[PDB]
Amino acid sequence: FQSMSVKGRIYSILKQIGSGGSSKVFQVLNEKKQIYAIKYVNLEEADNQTLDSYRNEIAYLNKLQQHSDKIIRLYDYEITDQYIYMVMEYGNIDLNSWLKKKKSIDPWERKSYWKNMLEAVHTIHQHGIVHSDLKPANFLIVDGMLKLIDFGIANQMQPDTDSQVGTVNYMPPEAIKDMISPKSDVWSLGCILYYMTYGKTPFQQIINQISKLHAIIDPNHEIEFPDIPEKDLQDVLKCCLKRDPKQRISIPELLAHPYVQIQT
Numbered sequence: 616f617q618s619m620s621v622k623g624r625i626y627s628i629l630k631q632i633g634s635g636g637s638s639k640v641f642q643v644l645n646e647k648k649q650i651y652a653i654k655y656v657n658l659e660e661a662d663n664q665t666l667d668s669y670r671n672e673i674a675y676l677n678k679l680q681q682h683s684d685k686i687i688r689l690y691d692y693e694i695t696d697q698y699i700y701m702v703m704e705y706g707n708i709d710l711n712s713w714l715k716k717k718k719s720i721d722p723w724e725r726k727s728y729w730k731n732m733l734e735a736v737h738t739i740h741q742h743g744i745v746h747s748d749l750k751p752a753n754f755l756i757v758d759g760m761l762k763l764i765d766f767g768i769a770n771q772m773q774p775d776t777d778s779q780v781g782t783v784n785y786m787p788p789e790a791i792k793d794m795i796s797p798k799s800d801v802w803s804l805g806c807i808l809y810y811m812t813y814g815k816t817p818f819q820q821i822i823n824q825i826s827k828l829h830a831i832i833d834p835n836h837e838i839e840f841p842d843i844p845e846k847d848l849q850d851v852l853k854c855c856l857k858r859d860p861k862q863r864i865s866i867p868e869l870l871a872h873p874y875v876q877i878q879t
C-alpha cells in the first residue's frame with residue numbers, strides 16, 4: 616500500500632514490475648488514476664562515474680523523445696544526491712517476455728516491430744549513441760508499438776514475480792574481438808529479428824559458454840538461415856549477421872530495404 620512523490624505530484628504504487636541491481640521500476644497511478652511506470656534508482660553506493668552515467672541516460676532520453684515517438688516517453692523526473700525518480704509512460708510488456716510466451720510470432724507483426732526497432736535505433740545513432748549491448752528487453756511494447764526504454768549504460772533489469780538465452784547471445788563479434796560502430800547495433804538487432812523469425816538466437820544451440828564467444832568471431836563458422844516464405848526477411852537476416860562491419864548493412868540501407876518498404 617505504498618505511495619511516492621515526484622515533483623510535487625503523488626503516485627500510488629500498484630506493484631513492482633521488475634528490479635535490476637540498484638534500481639527498481641513500479642506500476643503506479645497518479646492523482647487522476649492514470650497509469651505510469653516510475654523508475655527508482657538508489658545512488659547511495661553509486662560511484663562518481665556511475666552517477667555521471669545515469670545523468671547522461673536521463674539527459675539523452677529527455678532530448679531524444681522530442682525527435683521520435685519510438686523512444687520511451689519520460690513525462691517527468693526528480694534527481695537528488697541519493698535518488699532518481701523517472702516518470703515514464705507505462706508499457707504492456709517488454710519484448711523479451713512477450714517473445715518467451717509467443718511460440719510463433721505473426722509475420723505481419725514481426726515486420727511492424729522490426730520497423731519500430733529500426734526507427735528507434737536510427738534516432739539514437741543520429742544523436743551520437745551506439746547502444747552496443749542491445750537486447751530484446753531494451754524494447755517495450757506500448758499499444759502495439761515497440762519503444763526503446765533503455766540506452767544500455769548501466770542496466771541489469773529483469774522482471775520480478777524458461778530463460779533459454781544467455782547474456783552474450785546478442786553480442787557483436789567485434790566487441791568480443793575488442794579485447795565501436797553503429798553497425799554493431801545492426802548485428803544485435805539482426806539477432807532479435809532472427810529470434811523472431813526462427814525461434815532461437817543464432818548461437819543459442821551452443822552448449823559451452825567459452826567456445827560460444829569463439830564461435831561468434833570465427834569466420835569459418837556458418838549461421839543457419841532455413842528457407843521461408845519471406846525471401847526479403849532471409850536477406851535482411853544474412854545482411855545483418857555478416858561478421859565484417861564494413862560489409863554489414865547500415866540502418867539507412869535497412870530502412871530502404873524491400874522487407875521494410877514492400878507490401879504483402
Ligand SMILES: c1nc2c(NC3CCCCC3)nc(Nc3ccc(N4CCOCC4)cc3)nc2[nH]1
Pocket residue numbers: 632633634640652687703704705706707708709712752755764772773774775
Ligand atoms: C517504462 N519502463 C517500463 C518497464 N520496464 C521493465 C523493467 C524490467 C524488465 C522489463 C521492462 N516495464 C513496463 N511494463 C511491463 C509490464 C509488465 C511486465 N511483465 C509482464 C510479463 O511478466 C513480466 C512482467 C513487464 C514490463 N513499462 C515500462 N515503462
